Amino acid sequence: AAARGSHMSVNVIFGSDAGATRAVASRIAKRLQGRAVDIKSATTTDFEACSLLILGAPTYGFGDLQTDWETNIDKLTSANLAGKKVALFGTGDQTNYPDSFVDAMGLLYDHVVERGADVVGFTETAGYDYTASKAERDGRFVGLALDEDGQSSKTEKRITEWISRLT
Amino acid sequence: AAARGSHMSVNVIFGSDAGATRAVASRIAKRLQGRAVDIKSATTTDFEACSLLILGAPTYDLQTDWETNIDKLTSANLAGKKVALFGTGTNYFVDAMGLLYDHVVERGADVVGFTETAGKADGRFVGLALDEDGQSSKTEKRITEWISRLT
Ligand SMILES: Cc1cc2nc3c(=O)[nH]c(=O)nc-3n(C[C@H](O)[C@H](O)[C@H](O)COP(=O)(O)O)c2cc1C
Numbered sequence: 573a574a575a576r577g578s579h580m581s582v583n584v585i586f587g588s589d590a591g592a593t594r595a596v597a598s599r600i601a602k603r604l605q606g607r608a609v610d611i612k613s614a615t616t617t618d619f620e621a622c623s624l625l626i627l628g629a630p631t632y633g634f635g636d637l638q639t640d641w642e643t644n645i646d647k648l649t650s651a652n653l654a655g656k657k658v659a660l661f662g663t664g665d666q667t668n669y670p671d672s673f674v675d676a677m678g679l680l681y682d683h684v685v686e687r688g689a690d691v692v693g694f695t696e697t698a699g700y701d702y703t704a705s706k707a708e709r710d711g712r713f714v715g716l717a718l719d720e721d722g723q724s725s726k727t728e729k730r731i732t733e734w735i736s737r738l739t
Numbered sequence: 740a741a742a743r744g745s746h747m748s749v750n751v752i753f754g755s756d757a758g759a760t761r762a763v764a765s766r767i768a769k770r771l772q773g774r775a776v777d778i779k780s781a782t783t784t785d786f787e788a789c790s791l792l793i794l795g796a797p798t799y800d801l802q803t804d805w806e807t808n809i810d811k812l813t814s815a816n817l818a819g820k821k822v823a824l825f826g827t828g829t830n831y832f833v834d835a836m837g838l839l840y841d842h843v844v845e846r847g848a849d850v851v852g853f854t855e856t857a858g859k860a861d862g863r864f865v866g867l868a869l870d871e872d873g874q875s876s877k878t879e880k881r882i883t884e885w886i887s888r889l890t
């Protein structure tokens with residue numbers, strides 16, 4: 573008999589290549605008393621069996637989705653997300669990639685809106701320096717944009733402010 | 740933020756018309772730190788979002804709500820999932836358990852919690868057969884032993 577893994581019905585599904593998003597997802601999971609699930613081991617049930625779903629991904633290549641997310645994107649497209657509360661967080665480097673900043677978060681946003689999820693947790697682009705981002709809509713981000721490479725000292729505050737809006 | 744409803748990953752989907760199975764499922768869940776879900780309000784997610792699935796039904800001979808809602812069972816991915824069965828049933832025994840046993844086996848759910856018939860569901864009981872009508876003082880003991888076999 574295995575534990576559910578968290579008290580609250582929160583599933584944080586993430587992808588990571590160098591561990592930055594993995595650590596951020598675990599930090600987010602703790603605050604909401606949720607589970608941190610790697611997209612490589614996630615199931616469609618992980619997308620559906622939660623009252624609040626949070627998807628996280630870094631941006632790799634030329635503004636593309638992280639490789640595990642692309643391979644496992646079926647688990648997302650085959651999940652019933654209609655009317656489900658969904659939030660997004662993205663890791664990226666705004667200094668070295670100012671034209672494709674957290675672009676993978678925008679790719680995930682398009683994918684969950686098509687499946688009918690109610691997306692919450694929009695953030696402002698004020699403290700960020702970037703030229704273009706697929707994660708930007710109406711002058712704001714579709715979720716929490718974090719830069720562990722050059723702005724790690726601000727992620728702790730950004731996570732604190734972002735979560736308070738999700739509850 | 741809503742709680743999952745149980746600490747352990749156990750979902751007890753049951754069916755009851757008079758309240759006998761309902762009460763037994765509640766007790767089993769409390770002991771296993773699981774959720775008790777009526778099949779009328781159950782979801783396919785309730786079938787899949789657990790490491791141990793426990794299906795309960797009275798014999799009336801499947802209970803009417805279970806047949807009407809059998810979609811949720813046939814459309815749930817139980818392949819390789821651990822599933823256990825408990826059945827409620829002198830005047831007649833736990834026949835609906837066997838109908839529920841066949842369904843989960845057809846889905847591909849590894850069935851556990853087989854029970855001795857010493858007290859249509861070989862030579863061993865496929866799950867916890869409970870007779871609340873005339874043997875209720877032994878149901879608590881039968882549950883105790885059954886839980887030991889599941890852990
Ligand atoms: C080859 C490569 C391409 C990247 N492309 C982008 C990009 O287009 N946009 C962005 O915001 N960050 C980009 N980054 C930065 C990463 O997304 C950032 O380091 C992130 O924190 C990595 O998360 P992880 O360590 O969990 O994999 C790139 C990094 C590398 C190594």
Ligand SMILES: Cc1cc2nc3c(=O)[nH]c(=O)nc-3n(C[C@H](O)[C@H](O)[C@H](O)COP(=O)(O)O)c2cc1C
Pocket residue numbers: 754755756757758759760761797798799800827828831832833834871872
């Ligand atoms: C019409 C009818 C048929 C029944 N058929 C069976 C049967 O074949 N086998 C059995 O063991 N019990 C049978 N029972 C007994 C019930 O399964 C038993 O009373 C059970 O505890 C009912 O559970 P519930 O009150 O949660 O619905 C039947 C009861 C009724 C009213």
